[PDB]
Write a protein that binds this ligand. Structure first.
Ligand code: NI
Ligand code: NI
Ligand SMILES: [Zn+2]
Ligand SMILES: [Zn+2]
Ligand SMILES: [Zn+2]
Ligand SMILES: [Zn+2]
Lengths: 64, 63
């Protein structure tokens, strides 16, 4: 946040699954709208691990 | 070889709505899954600008 390097790092890390930080986020949870997980990490959850809202759909998204 | 600053500008630009390029992307199109537009510009499209798939739902994103 307080330097260009940190800004760059933030935007790079922002793309990654918040659970494994090994793969890009590839799922948006409906209805809550959180971008949290890659496909692999989303497999195990029935509620959003950020807000705990019941997930009615795991929509695949393209994040590059 | 690309400067920290140029890499940063590129990623920032990547985040911008592909219609207005003023606000950040804020919507995911169902079912194609493309992230294309901010909330305001999503009102104007009935097909995804990237793949032309008919949009059945516009899901707001939260990061
Ligand atoms: Ni790792
Ligand atoms: Ni403008
Ligand atoms: Zn993951
Ligand atoms: Zn959530
Ligand atoms: Zn826009
Ligand atoms: Zn599309």
């Amino acid at each position: 946040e307080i330097s260009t390097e940190e800004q760059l790092r933030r935007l790079q890390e922002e793309k990654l699954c918040k659970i494994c930080m090994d793969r890009n986020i590839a799922i948006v949870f409906v209805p809550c709208g959180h971008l949290v997980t890659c496909k692999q990490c989303a497999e195990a959850v029935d509620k959003c691990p950020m807000c705990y809202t019941v997930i009615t759909f795991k929509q695949k998204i393209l994040m590059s």
